[PDB]
Amino acid sequence: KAAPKTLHQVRNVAYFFAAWLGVQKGYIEKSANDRLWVEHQRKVRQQNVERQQALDSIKLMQQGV
């Protein structure tokens, strides 16, 4: 059993590992972006609620009970 003249199997494994690592990088980036957008939407809804509350308060003052 002589020494291997080629390293094809190791190269294939390394190819798979590199592709997997790239996939992990992309997944992490996408997940972070999704979390950021979720927080932004939550803030938008909170601002809308505050605006509606302010409008209701002004209408209540106009009612003058």
């Binding site: 190819y15 592709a19 690592l21 932004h40």
Partner: protein, 129 residues
């Protein structure tokens, strides 16, 4: 519609007869006599061999890992090995980039909500895409 088909068949027949490979001609003759398909048989043989060589691949991988780790690979390092390693590195880089693109499922990085480019997303001509 028929003359073209006949011409293509004739050209392929001429090219098939032209090749001077004894094994290929023998297989073609045998399959023609039996009425079977040579290409499909070759595909099945290759798949069977690969199925039976999986653990051979594993053993070869471990042997190559031992060869590299032992330092014997670098003892006989030559320019050809350098060329192969450069090819290997290039493939690794391109695969990493492709993997990132597929992982984020987008060619370009996604835009953050606080970025001023959000307007572009709002002004899409076709929101479906």
């Amino acid at each position: 519609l028929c003359n073209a088909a006949s011409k293509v068949q004739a050209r392929s027949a001429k090219k098939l007869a032209a090749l001077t490979d004894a094994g290929i001609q023998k297989t073609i003759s045998e399959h023609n006599a039996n009425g079977t398909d040579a290409a499909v048989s070759s595909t099945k043989r290759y798949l069977a061999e690969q199925r039976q060589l999986f653990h051979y691949r594993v053993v070869r991988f471990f042997d190559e890992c031992h060869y590299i780790i032992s330092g014997e690979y670098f003892a006989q390092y030559t320019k050809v090995n350098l060329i192969w390693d450069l090819r290997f590195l290039t493939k690794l880089v391109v695969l990493f980039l492709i993997g990132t693109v597929l992982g984020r499922q987008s060619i370009f990085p996604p835009i953050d909500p606080d970025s001023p480019l959000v307007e572009a997303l709002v002004t899409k001509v076709n929101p479906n895409y």
